[PDB]
Amino acid sequence: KIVNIGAVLSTRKHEQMFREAVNQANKRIQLQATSVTHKPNAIQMALSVCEDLISSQVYAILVSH
């Protein structure tokens, strides 16, 4: 029961908090963490789509500005 959740974050401390909440979800069942980023170019943001969607476990994207 393993899953991998996609997001967009400016810094990686929020990804660490996301992994802490991944553990709190794993209290109830397996969850992984994706390589999230916040790029200053939407062309590069479109190019990262295959780099993030390359797996089967990829979940809904949680996007920040």
Binding site: A46, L47, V49, C50
Partner: protein
């Protein structure tokens, strides 16, 4: 510039766009298309815009 294109990844078509820009400074394009691709019609327009 009559270029052929196999029905492939639309992200690779987006790569192909400034591949053929590197082939020639392209101001105008024409591109034949399949008859069942409306989600790709939702794709192509905002890439242009």
């Amino acid at each position: 510039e009559l270029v052929a294109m196999n029905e492939t990844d639309p992200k690779s078509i987006i790569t192909r766009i400034c591949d053929l820009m590197s082939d020639r400074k392209i101001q105008g394009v024409v591109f034949a298309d399949d008859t069942d691709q409306e989600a790709i019609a939702q794709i192509l327009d905002f890439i242009s815009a």
